């Protein structure tokens, strides 16, 4: 069963923002929002999508694991850690557009869509360039139904070998400490309106899990790190986190 608290809203409207934080507790199977309607409405997943991409990718062998380095293409971009060296864990952790490009062209359109069917990702739709639509092209994704995709990820119930998922879940951990460990990826949609960034994963506790999917609007890249802040905020007045 799924709550609507709207006095959450107060977390984006204080920063002059709109968005939605989707909260789900494992050992209680039970949901949180403060807007149902825009948890579920479907947005394009941006860099989330290298999630779903870097499992199709290893289970193919197009990436061989987390330690294969993908050269620089010597081609300068403006995000300045993108013009050097990655393997899979850097490439996630600065969201690495261009190396994700290249594992696609290699994956290929009918595996490309035959996975995303498998995984039951979003509206399983790459319409678009094979190198491009999880930026401009037709896929898109609700929080709630990240929520669901990445539930089966933790459980390594996805259609792609238990190796794969562990090295993809390796790829995720952003933070950890004595009191829980977040795996999870950013994401920043701007090709098509409205502009939202993401903010998908898990909070991993000792003895349960909560399954977080926020995303909010992002009209310019100055609100950025409000993503993650504002996630932080509602676990900790949740008491999730200290
Ligand atoms: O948070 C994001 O989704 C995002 C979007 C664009 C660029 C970068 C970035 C900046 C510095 C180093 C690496 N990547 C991150």
Redesign the pocket.
């Given at each position: 069963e799924w709550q609507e608290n709207k006095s959450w809203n107060a977390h984006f409207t204080e920063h002059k923002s709109q968005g939605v934080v989707v909260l789900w507790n494992e050992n209680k199977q039970q949901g949180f929002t403060n807007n149902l309607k825009r948890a579920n409405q479907a947005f394009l997943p941006?860099?989330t999508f290298k999630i779903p991409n870097s499992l199709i990718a290893l289970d193919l062998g197009v990436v061989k694991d987390e330690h294969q380095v993908f050269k620089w293409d010597g081609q300068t971009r403006d995000?300045?850690?993108?013009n050097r060296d990655h393997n899979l864990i850097t490439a996630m952790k600065?969201?690495?557009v261009p190396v994700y490009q290249e594992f696609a062209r290699q994956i290929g359109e009918a595996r490309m869509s035959k996975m995303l069917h498998a995984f039951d990702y979003g509206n399983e739709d790459i319409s678009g360039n094979v190198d491009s639509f999880w930026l401009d092209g037709g896929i898109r994704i609700s929080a709630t139904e990240q929520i669901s995709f990445l539930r089966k990820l933790y459980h390594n119930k996805l259609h792609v070998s238990e190796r794969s998922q562990r090295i993809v879940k390796q790829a995720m951990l952003t933070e950890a400490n004595g009191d829980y460990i977040i795996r999870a990826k950013?994401?920043?949609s701007t090709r098509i309106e409205p502009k939202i960034?993401w903010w998908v994963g898990w909070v991993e506790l000792d003895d349960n899990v909560w399954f977080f999917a926020m995303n909010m609007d992002m009209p310019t890249?100055d609100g950025?790190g409000l993503?993650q802040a504002i996630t932080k905020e509602v676990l900790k007045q949740e008491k999730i986190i200290p």
């Open positions: 941006a860099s995000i300045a850690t993108w600065y969201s690495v950013t994401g920043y960034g890249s950025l993503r």
